[PDB]
């Protein structure tokens, strides 16, 4: 197994994956590493089952058809790993946390959204639809967008939001397209 955690990139009190070698801190892992479970597949592992299960599930999906599926348990799992990727990126630190406005110029937005919100709120099962948890996923940069105006820190969401995209293309098997 990985000596760090797979997600935030240092070492400290490790839970080591059974089926393949990343290692992961407890609350780092989406959903938090399971208390018994010997052996233990991380999220990483899951998902490639998934895919394993049902090759055809990576053809190419419409997102309109992606974000009104039902939060049933494999579209529950692909959401908790695309939060997962996104707090994998270092730049996550700007958006883990709730947010404040204060700035010469600019009021802020009117429903603020930070990443640990967005997993309370998977956790909690409270998003029915994909559609959910995208929306608020795609909230939280653009409400970083409007606060920061010229500002060059709005960059930060751009790169963030980025992530996040490449991401949901790939767990949600986004049809490609020019
Ligand atoms: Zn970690
Ligand atoms: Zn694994
Ligand atoms: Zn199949």
Known sequence: NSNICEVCNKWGRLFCCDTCPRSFHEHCH???VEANKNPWSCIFCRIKTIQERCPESQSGHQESEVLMRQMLPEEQLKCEFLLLKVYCDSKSCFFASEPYYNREGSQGPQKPMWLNKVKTSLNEQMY???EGFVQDMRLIFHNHKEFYREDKFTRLGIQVQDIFEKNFRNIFA?????
Do not use: N, Y
């Not at 986004?174 to 020019?178: F, L």
């Open 128 to 130: 029915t639809r994909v």
């Open 30 to 32: 989406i959903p938090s």
């Open 174 to 178: 986004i049809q490609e397209t020019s």
